[PDB]
Design a protein around this ligand. Structure first.
Ligand SMILES: CCCC(=O)Nc1nnn(CC)n1
Ligand SMILES: [Zn+2]
Ligand SMILES: [Zn+2]
Ligand SMILES: [Zn+2]
Ligand SMILES: [Zn+2]
Lengths: 77, 69
């Protein structure tokens, strides 16, 4: 029905919000410190000297383990 | 349809995974450092000496700003 399409759209937007804002291909799993913006995968976070959201200098990157993380292992057998 | 029910289930599970593992009422927005487990809201995280997932000592709590917030 039309509600199936509406729910498909909400699910797609929620999943897109969980992907790296720079490469758009990998899940977010890194925090820029000290600002706290958590918007990149580990590969894009390592290459940025300043935060892409607030422009604060990145002192270091903290890896984050989130309950929403998925990997190829989560595939349905 | 049945497909609508399946999508509603996936959305509900994704939203429940974003909630604090201790109070179950507030969104996760804090990381235990240095282990990196990001499983609590600020209020529950502030009171813990050790990570509730891996038992590593918490040296400090980093507030996180996620696009899903
Ligand atoms: C309140 C917690 C929301 C959350 O976990 N968001 C999120 N954003 N990107 N990811 C990567 C899977 N996960
Ligand atoms: Zn990336
Ligand atoms: Zn920032
Ligand atoms: Zn809590
Ligand atoms: Zn931990």
């Amino acid at each position: 029905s039309q509600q199936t399409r509406v729910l498909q759209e909400k699910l797609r937007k929620l999943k897109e919000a969980m992907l790296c804002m720079v490469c758009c291909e990998e899940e977010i799993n890194s925090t820029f410190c000290p600002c706290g913006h958590t918007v990149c995968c580990e590969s894009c976070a390592a290459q940025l000297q300043s935060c892409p959201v607030c422009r604060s200098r990145v002192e270091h990157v903290q890896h984050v383990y989130l309950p929403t993380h998925t990997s190829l292992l989560n595939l349905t057998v």
